[PDB]
Design a protein around this ligand. Sequence first.
Ligand SMILES: Nc1n[nH]c(N2CCC(N(CCc3ccc(Cl)cc3)Cc3ccccc3)CC2)n1
Length: 377
Amino acid sequence: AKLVCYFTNWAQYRQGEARFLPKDLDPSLCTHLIYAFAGMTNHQLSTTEWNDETLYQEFNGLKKMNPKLKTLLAIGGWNFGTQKFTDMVATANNRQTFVNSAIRFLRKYSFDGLDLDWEYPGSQGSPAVDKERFTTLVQDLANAFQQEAQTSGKERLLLSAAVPAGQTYVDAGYEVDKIAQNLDFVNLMAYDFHGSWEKVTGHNSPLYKRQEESGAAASLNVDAAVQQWLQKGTPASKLILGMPTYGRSFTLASSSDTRVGAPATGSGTPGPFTKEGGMLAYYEVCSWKGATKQRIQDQKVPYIFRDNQWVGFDDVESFKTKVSYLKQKGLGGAMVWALDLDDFAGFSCNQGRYPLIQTLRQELSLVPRGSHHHHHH
Ligand SMILES: Nc1n[nH]c(N2CCC(N(CCc3ccc(Cl)cc3)Cc3ccccc3)CC2)n1
């Protein structure tokens, strides 16, 4: 099994106990650590934060303590846009420029691979031709990584991609059966299914549909997303199920209607640390005073409300349920967004350090046998 965990290079700017750096990283927590995010300059892989080079050394230095650990660098993300990807994949020359830059960059900074996080080929302004061009990019990278291993004698660089769960995005951008052959693993973004952009409350990451749902809405859940990627040709062993250590919040139209599907007027109040309306870290929801926690029986996930605030999130129990699910489907493991959104320092939830991600590790049977300081949940 794999446990793929994302580090984010902006978590260093959060205040107080929520501030996260590589020193808060546990080298033996995950099997693969992915660094979000790199960018692109003149079709070449580039840093995005002023101290990335410092952080790269600390991040990849974790392998000195756990030599089994693999690291990857993720390019793109949700604020990156699409135009730079579009321009880079548009010609063989630009793809070659990018591919060679990626090999050089990853080797220089001691990363073991590249994770592609384009949001998304064929959507969000990216033209329809980018679907086939993304396939070509994936093939170009896989082939060039293979060749570099042959010629250098080094362990081959890994290639992964973070891919969407929603059928509209999948069909617009992803030749699933083709790319799955060339990717080492596929990081399924099984979250952001619902959120404050919608007029009624809904859960960030429900495992199954609600009985009431129909049409396209009935596929906005983890099980449907997993089955979608499997049926479209991803080998189960390559499919890695995303797990969110965050939730999505709503302001209710009325404090007297707190159901799933209740009317909402907009985003929930921003959290005290993450400061982004509509989103909360697990550590911002786990210890919410005077709130009422509920479970969505059909969907196997919790929500919590207080006054006119409603948040759908994941807890230890839902993570256990989802790992049981992925094992039943024979998936290659779990992926988690993100290290800095779990209670990484144990400052909030009274469940020790990394309660959610330790739960993943435990349920995947990945607890190091020589481990001393882990906490079972
Ligand atoms: N593997 C992987 N690669 N990329 C991803 N996902 C992780 C979840 C991201 N998704 C949530 C990121 C996010 C999570 C928690 C918080 Cl407090 C703030 C931001 C993007 C998002 C959507 C709506 C509003 C703001 C931002 C979207 C990218 N997963």
